[PDB]
Amino acid sequence: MATPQDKLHTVRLFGTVAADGLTMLDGAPGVRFRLEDKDNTSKTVWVLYKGAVPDTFKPGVEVIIEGGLAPGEDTFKARTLMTKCPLE
């Protein structure tokens, strides 16, 4: 009998945005892209973010996403997005 982590512990994931497969929602606000894991750069997870995608969001910008990869779903549903490098 122990006290575990909170049930609604959302999944904060870290990596960099690729140019390869940076595919936005066709006629809808959002973006699908492969987040290249910095530990293993062949571990490319297809992150799907809905809503206003920042101008600072570019292919090559290291981003912090938050959401979750559902058992059965092939895309990580990011409910929030955080970009580090601005328009440079």
From TrEMBL:
Naturally occurring in which organism (per UniProt): Nitratidesulfovibrio vulgaris (strain ATCC 29579 / DSM 644 / CCUG 34227 / NCIMB 8303 / VKM B-1760 / Hildenborough) (Desulfovibrio vulgaris)
Record carries keyword Heme: yes
Subcellular localization(s) per the UniProt record: Membrane
Protein's name according to its UniProt entry: Cytochrome c-type biogenesis protein CcmE
Coiled-coil residues: none
Molecular function GO terms recorded: heme binding
GO cellular component, one term: plasma membrane
Keywords from the UniProt entry: Cytochrome c-type biogenesis, Heme, Iron, Membrane, Metal-binding, Transmembrane, Transmembrane helix
One record GO biological process: cytochrome complex assembly
